[PDB]
Design a binder for this molecule. Structure first.
Ligand SMILES: [K+]
Ligand SMILES: [Mg+2]
Ligand SMILES: [Mg+2]
Ligand SMILES: [Mg+2]
Ligand SMILES: [Mg+2]
Ligand SMILES: [Mg+2]
Ligand SMILES: [Mg+2]
Ligand SMILES: [Mg+2]
Ligand SMILES: [Mg+2]
Ligand SMILES: [Mg+2]
Ligand SMILES: [Mg+2]
Ligand SMILES: [Mg+2]
Ligand SMILES: [Mg+2]
Ligand SMILES: [Mg+2]
Ligand SMILES: [Mg+2]
Ligand SMILES: [Mg+2]
Ligand SMILES: [Mg+2]
Ligand SMILES: [Mg+2]
Ligand SMILES: [Mg+2]
Ligand SMILES: [Mg+2]
Ligand SMILES: [Mg+2]
Ligand SMILES: [Mg+2]
Ligand SMILES: [Mg+2]
Ligand SMILES: [Mg+2]
Lengths: 208, 136, 101, 99, 132, 198
RNA sequence: GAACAAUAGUAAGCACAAUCAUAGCACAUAAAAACGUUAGGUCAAGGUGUAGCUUAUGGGUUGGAAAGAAAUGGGCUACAUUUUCUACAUAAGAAUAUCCACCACACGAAAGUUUUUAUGAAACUAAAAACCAAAGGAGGAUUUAGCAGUAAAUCAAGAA
């Protein structure tokens, strides 16, 4: 790490600076940020103040990347959002009056909602006691649950897809499947709940 | 469309894996006779492109280098109409057109700030604008 | 006395190569050219191979001038890797210092 | 490539001194053989070895003349003397194992 | 453990001069090079001939002045002339010092075919930098 | 207060950490009481003044040349890539890098997002005409370098308060992350060869 | 052989520290790391103790050290669709293990056969092309590396 302990993470949100007069405690926070003369790290290349970005997209885009092809990973994430948009637009056209104002045509809304349904609620961690390993359920933290949902999405669409079907279209199908709570990822989430509920009497082993 | 391909070199090879001249192909040779100005009662609209070109650099777009010495030689005279990017009036019309079809589905895409970002990123170019609007 | 019998052999080998350097060059010119008749080139091959074995540039071996180590020798200083460190660590070589970056 | 270019290529070669007539890729090596110095005649090759015979002989004579005192040669002589005293020396010719 | 051109710690009774008291990684940091010449520059030739000549002088000066040499020589090469700077103890009578100076200057000049300069600085004893 | 090393050079005697802490605390008791004129002279001998501490940047004044109004120059460097940016405040929104349009020179959307970041933060996307000259590095190294140069060159046209906002966003701070060397005996900068235990 | 509201320890030497290098500082990385441990490795870098050889355990010439039943370590290329081929820097076209009335086909030879080139007195060494298209369809017990411009992917030069 070329940054010393004094350097801190920069603040990028423009709206945080343009309307500071409506609050007092937050004003004391950033006025002392430079009054303490604390050094600020350089702005990361990925994050930007553009209003069209989203933090959950960047993390998902990074995991899709293999090697160092950020261009290819960004290209795949662009097509997948387009592919989802095309399918929802077509379904909207062929619908009745009541069905028309039900379909969502916002890929970002679909993407955010899809991952919030693939996150497990309670995980498992092996614990060694008496020379044997017992799968003990634990209340997984929010960051772990969010990361675990993304990994399951990538793992499924990389392994059990056909060789002919492209990556952007295969991932688009699973997002719609997870949006309706019927995708194989949702099945895997329930399977982890099945094992956690089966070993509900082993929760006493953990010591935290 | 892609008149520069009627004179440039051809990737296709033969049984000896040796490149063939563009005049070997019958389709190009006969179509070549359809652009030499000798007949009456007709008009031909041409377009020199780069996306499908062979052995041409990405940056080159002017008619002379795309056609080369031979291509430009057998095309004079002509009227080199130049296609430009969007003007500020056109840019607003294209953006408003998508908003009428509910294409730009981002929450903040309806504001002027989103319009400024689209103008800067796309450089008011129709080709880049379509790619951006397809996923935002 | 050279430091080893191997070093003495190299001196004889280099000396023999120098004497027959020009004569080999003239004959080798005929072989390496395709415009001369093939009959003459075959005769040249017989003559070039009739020269003494030690008079061959490829048989010259680059050793260290101090300890005669057959390998691990820098060509610029003509010294073995062990001897080069021995001279350089004491500061006895100008402009040579431990690399730090 | 036209006949005009062939004359210009040859005419330029004539003035600057290169080969005028066409020459094969393999046939240009004979020009390279005489253009450059042969490997066996470079000063780096035949003068690679310092003349240890003169270096050793000169310091040998200066040692006997009292102008140069070599510790290392004195060490060998002192130890060689002790071996003779202990009774273990180098036998003469024809005395190793024939007796 | 590194052992290149180092003197090991042994209580506090062994004198050490400035040259021997610094590890080889201190070269060009605390102590300079005992010899300076053009051969080891970037685009200069004739570097092996200088090296072998340098080693010979390290062995000739050490043997010409037995016991009375203080520490390592310093060899400077300017133009085609060779300057040798030495530290010599007060051991031999001044008559012998001038004999050896005259002997060394003539013999080396006719051996390397270059003029030789021999400058001497006399010290009462070896200069001690640490310990003692 | 005096540093332990400085105090040892004032009393000409070696001290210890426990002794130094006790002495300083005693001065605090002396300084916390009502102060007399003689005591203040005694105390001030143990006082030391720190240098001026500030993180404000030096605003480069605007330059005018050959009827040219409101043009400033900036210097930026990031990951073996130096960028020279001069920005005119009297033109429309366009950037000319190395004699070519920026869109042609930066096909990657992310790279063109880096150039937007300084201008978009100040809401002056179309109010400045710029020409740039960047050399060395890859596509991202040049894009980051041009971003840094614009941030420093735009400080002239912007008020001082928003310059502080620029620093808090990380625009004005150079990126110190550079490629490391390859150690002798390792596959890469940190990766080592396979370690067979037996 | 220490108790800081201090109860026997003291000041110097080596090491750590600080400093220096990587052309600003900082951070980071290099560099450093004593006394000892493993009779650790090196008589074949060179020198040398002791022991041995001396018309021979020395010196020179010519020719020759093949070969892999099998086991294992470290690597390169792969087992493709985030892929292959071509154009070109990254907005393109085309191919795609299957269908079949016949055909013919993807990824992947670095290997092998033949031809040619480069070096050299000598090609057995290296490289290019043509032909050829095999194993391989993500790998058992077990195990290695990495904390940020790092892992990983890709490109280039130099030492001899
Ligand atoms: K021995
Ligand atoms: Mg020997
Ligand atoms: Mg041959
Ligand atoms: Mg050789
Ligand atoms: Mg790596
Ligand atoms: Mg200390
Ligand atoms: Mg430094
Ligand atoms: Mg440090
Ligand atoms: Mg180290
Ligand atoms: Mg240190
Ligand atoms: Mg042992
Ligand atoms: Mg061991
Ligand atoms: Mg051993
Ligand atoms: Mg020996
Ligand atoms: Mg042995
Ligand atoms: Mg012996
Ligand atoms: Mg023998
Ligand atoms: Mg095996
Ligand atoms: Mg290895
Ligand atoms: Mg490949
Ligand atoms: Mg394509
Ligand atoms: Mg194939
Ligand atoms: Mg192939
Ligand atoms: Mg092959």
């Amino acid at each position: 790490s070329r940054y010393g302990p004094e350097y801190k993470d920069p603040q990028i949100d423009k709206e945080y600076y343009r309307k500071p007069l409506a609050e007092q405690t937050e004003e004391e926070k950033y006025e002392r940020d430079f009054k303490k003369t604390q050094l600020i790290k350089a702005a990361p290349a990925t994050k930007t103040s553009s209003v069209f970005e989203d933090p959950v997209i960047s993390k998902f885009t990074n995991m899709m990347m293999k090697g160092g092809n950020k261009v290819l990973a960004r290209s795949l994430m662009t097509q997948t959002l387009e592919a989802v948009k095309r399918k929802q637009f077509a379904k909207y056209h062929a619908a009745s009056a009541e069905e028309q104002a039900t379909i969502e045509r916002n890929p970002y809304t679909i993407f955010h909602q899809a991952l919030k349904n693939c996150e497990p609620v309670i995980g498992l961690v092996p614990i060694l006691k008496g020379g044997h390993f017992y799968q003990v359920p634990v209340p997984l933290a929010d960051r772990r649950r969010r990361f675990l949902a993304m990994k399951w999405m990538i793992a499924e669409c990389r392994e059990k897809k056909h060789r002919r079907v492209l990556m952007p279209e295969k991932l688009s199908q699973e997002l719609l499947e997870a949006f309706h709570n019927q995708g194989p990822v949702i099945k895997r989430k329930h399977d982890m709940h099945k094992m956690a509920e089966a070993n509900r009497a082993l929760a006493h082993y953990r010591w935290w | 469309d892609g008149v520069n391909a009627l004179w440039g070199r051809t990737t296709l090879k033969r049984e000896d894996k040796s490149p063939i001249a563009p005049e070997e192909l019958a389709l190009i040779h006969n179509l070549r006779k359809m652009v030499k100005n000798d007949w009456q009662g007709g008009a031909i609209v041409l377009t020199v492109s780069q996306t499908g070109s062979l052995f041409k650099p990405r940056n080159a777009y002017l008619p002379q280098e795309l056609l080369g010495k031979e291509g430009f030689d057998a095309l004079d005279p002509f009227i080199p109409i130049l296609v430009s990017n969007y003007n500020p009036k056109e840019f607003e019309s294209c953006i408003q057109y998508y908003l009428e079809n509910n294409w730009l589905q981002h929450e903040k895409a309806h504001t002027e700030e989103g319009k400024k970002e689209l103008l800067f990123l796309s450089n008011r170019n129709p080709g880049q604008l379509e790619r951006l609007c397809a996923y935002l | 006395y050279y430091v080893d019998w191997k070093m003495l052999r190299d001196v004889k080998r280099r000396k023999m190569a120098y004497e027959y350097a020009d004569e080999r060059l003239r004959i080798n010119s005929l072989r390496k050219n395709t415009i001369l008749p093939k009959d003459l080139q075959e005769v040249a091959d017989e003559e070039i191979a009739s020269l003494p074995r030690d008079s061959c540039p490829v048989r010259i071996r680059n050793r260290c001038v101090m300890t005669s180590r057959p390998r691990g020798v820098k060509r610029r200083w003509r010294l073995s890797r062990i001897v080069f460190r021995h001279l350089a660590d004491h500061g006895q070589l100008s402009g040579v210092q431990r690399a730090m970056w | 490539l036209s006949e005009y270019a062939v004359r210009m290529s040859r005419l330029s070669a004539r003035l600057f001194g290169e080969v005028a007539r066409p020459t094969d890729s393999k046939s240009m090596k004979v020009v390279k053989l005489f253009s450059e110095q042969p490997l066996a005649k470079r000063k780096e090759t035949y003068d690679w070895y310092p003349n240890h015979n003169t270096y050793f002989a000169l310091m040998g004579t200066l040692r006997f003349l009292g102008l140069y005192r070599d510790e290392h040669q004195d060490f060998r002589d002192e130890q060689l003397r002790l071996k003779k005293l202990r009774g273990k020396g180098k036998p003469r010719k024809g005395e190793g194992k024939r007796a | 453990k590194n052992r290149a051109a180092r003197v090991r710690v042994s209580k506090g009774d062994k004198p050490v001069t400035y040259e021997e008291a610094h590890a080889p990684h201190y070269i060009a940091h605390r102590k300079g090079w005992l010899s300076l010449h053009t051969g080891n520059l970037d685009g200069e030739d004739h570097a092996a001939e200088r090296t072998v000549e340098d080693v010979f002088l390290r062995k000739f000066m050490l043997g010409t002045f037995p016991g009375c040499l203080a520490d390592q020589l310093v060899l400077k090469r300017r133009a085609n002339q060779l300057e040798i700077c030495a530290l010599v103890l007060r051991q031999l009578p001044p008559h012998k010092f001038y004999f050896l100076v005259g002997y060394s200057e003539t013999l080396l000049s006719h051996f390397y075919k270059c003029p030789v300069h021999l400058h001497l600085q006399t010290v009462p004893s070896k200069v001690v930098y640490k310990y003692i | 207060w005096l540093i332990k090393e400085e105090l040892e050079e004032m009393l000409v005697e070696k001290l210890s950490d426990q002794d130094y802490a006790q002495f300083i605390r005693l001065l605090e008791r002396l300084s916390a009481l009502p102060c007399g004129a003689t005591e203040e002279d005694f105390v001030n001998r143990f006082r030391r003044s720190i240098p001026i501490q500030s993180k404000k940047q030096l605003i480069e004044p605007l330059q005018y040349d050959e009827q040219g109004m409101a043009f400033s120059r900036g210097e930026g460097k990031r990951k073996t890539a130096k960028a020279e940016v001069v920005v005119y405040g009297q033109g429309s929104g366009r950037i000319d890098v190395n004699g070519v349009d920026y869109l042609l020179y930066f096909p990657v959307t992310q790279d063109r997002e880096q150039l937007m970041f300084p201008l978009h933060f100040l809401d002056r996307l179309g109010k400045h005409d710029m020409t740039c000259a960047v050399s060395g590095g890859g596509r991202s190294a040049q894009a980051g370098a041009v971003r840094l140069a614009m941030a420093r060159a735009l400080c002239s046209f912007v008020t001082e308060d928003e310059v502080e906002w620029m620093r808090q966003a990380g625009l004005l701070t150079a990126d110190p992350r550079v490629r490391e060397r390859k150690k002798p005996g390792q596959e890469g900068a940190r990766r080592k060869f396979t370690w067979k235990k037996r």
